[PDB]
Symmetry: C4
Subunit: 192 residues, 4 copies
Amino acid sequence: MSRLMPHYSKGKTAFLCVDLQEAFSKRIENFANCVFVANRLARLHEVVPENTKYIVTEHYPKGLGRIVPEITLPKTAHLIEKTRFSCVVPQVEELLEDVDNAVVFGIEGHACILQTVADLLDMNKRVFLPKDGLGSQKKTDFKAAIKLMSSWGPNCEITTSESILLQMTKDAMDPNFKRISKLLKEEPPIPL
Amino acid sequence: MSRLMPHYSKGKTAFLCVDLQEAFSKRIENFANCVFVANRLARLHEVVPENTKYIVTEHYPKGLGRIVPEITLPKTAHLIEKTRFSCVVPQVEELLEDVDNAVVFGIEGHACILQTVADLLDMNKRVFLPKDGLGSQKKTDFKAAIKLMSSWGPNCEITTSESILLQMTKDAMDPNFKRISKLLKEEPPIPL
Amino acid sequence: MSRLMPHYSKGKTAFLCVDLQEAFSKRIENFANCVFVANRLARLHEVVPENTKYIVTEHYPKGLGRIVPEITLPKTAHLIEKTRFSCVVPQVEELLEDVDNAVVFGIEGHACILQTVADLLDMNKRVFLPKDGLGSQKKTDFKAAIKLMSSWGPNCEITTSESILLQMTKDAMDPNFKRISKLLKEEPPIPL
Amino acid sequence: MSRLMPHYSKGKTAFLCVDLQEAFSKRIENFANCVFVANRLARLHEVVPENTKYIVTEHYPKGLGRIVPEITLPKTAHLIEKTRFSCVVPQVEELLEDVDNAVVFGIEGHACILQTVADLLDMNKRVFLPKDGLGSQKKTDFKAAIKLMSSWGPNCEITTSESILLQMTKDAMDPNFKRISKLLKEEPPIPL
């Protein structure tokens, strides 16, 4: 019945960076905020790496798209490729064999993101989504997938990246706070 | 506890094209997007016919309305007529005796659509609705029926037609993808 | 697990017309649509009286407010008065001893309406609310009470008065349809 | 299965005034409405003190912020300080050992407020939140935390301060009504 992200040191969390590729960069209004959140969670995972993996999927890469350069991946990143609309492919499954929580971000809300989270839920992981770092080409598709997923509690939760950073460091006197606090002073390309 | 549309080859799905008739064509702002979605799912069913039926109801046809010509029905279509506000009439019931999923689209959200889905739910079918291809004459009636139905999970889900096509072909290397992909490159009369 | 209003002839339904009085007439933007819906359900109940009661509460009447004249009450109306914020007072309780469904409409969404429906739910009645015929002085109070109540399913449902008339006459060949249809051709003071 | 605030004399209620400090005063658009609600519940608790405690947390006070002067605290107030993002610290826990309901208000919706309510829920208290007296620096963070929490029923409820005052005095002939009514005639800085 647990209700938000637990302290970062309880279990493991995968950051899952979904399909942020070149074909899309122009097609989605808040693509840049998605990039920002991808960077934010990237730097966060470097703060706390014995507790968090970071995962990049690229979808049919060569046929329109490699993972936009403005995302500076961590050296530890598990970069993987697929044609499945959902991120849950053989590679990522085993890479989640010991992971309790998935923080899922990227494009598109109603397509890969949506299928990815239903699969995660079926795997019994808790899923957490910064709305912050989600997008679709069209509003109607996005807005509908977002409401569907909001009805998928208690194991699915939509908040934002600032909410999520704060949920993992439950205290401002946390050994990692000064580092994490610094991320939070960065401002998005498109104002929230 | 299943969470989205399953792969098209698991079970059967009825496309249910509800009351898109002449009296209404002018009375509903997004009537044309409803037509677009009706065509979209029509062409889709022709892609995958051993797995999907297609059903058109016309409500009190002669007294104001036959099914708008700009919808090019599949040859396989089960076209039926009624006065019941809900589509669940004797004819359609038996035509669902072996169907697991219903994709319901048309007019009006708060009237025939709304009654139709509560009946489907009572029949234990999973219902999937492209918000895309729904409408009412007035916002207030639509918006309210849509929220009611969003609270009818897990067996009712409101997304859109692009979300739904992608949910049925779970992979971009699917034998049917190139065909289905082509539908998705078509753009609606009224931008989403 | 029933999902909408049943056919008018299955059980009994109270129409509950809540606090539409003079003090308020000016204080609420859609007061007039509330009046319209009050009239609509009034005429409806006259169509089907062996199955529906009609109930008017006036709240502290003499100290600012009798029930606005532009509502033409049915002769059968059970007009009652109180100081309780909720409509569930001794008089109305016994007047619901054999009633299965309550259609609740009036003012204010977050105050009398809100308390009234929580009490009804505690009495095991199904409650149905035309958003149509609800209002508050301020948006913020209304909008919040409306969302709370939307989360009170399966025995609470918010739709509109056209949705509700159609749900009770499940067929356009219903002996009462022509009469009920005629109500639906009336247009509200403030467009929906 | 209880559905709103019970009459003020059934059990105990803590008013919890969360982080309304100087650093924030300018950073949040509706900060002043939060102050208004803080005052409103302050005066209310003085009306009914054998049944309600009032609690102010200040978060890292000296390092940017003491509790804004325009809030005139009750003499009975339990003013406490912390670095935990959530209000549930050792001091407040024991101060809730005999409290059934918490009315939670302040800043920020997605941060301290959000963590505070998940902890309260874990403690089996009913939580009630006047949306009225909540805020965040950015819309996106607020709006998302608000929806998450709306899905946390039956023991969490978001309404407003007028709804909440009325829910605790279930009758306009209540010995405390004239006093409480007077609070309700006060108007917020930023119109609801």
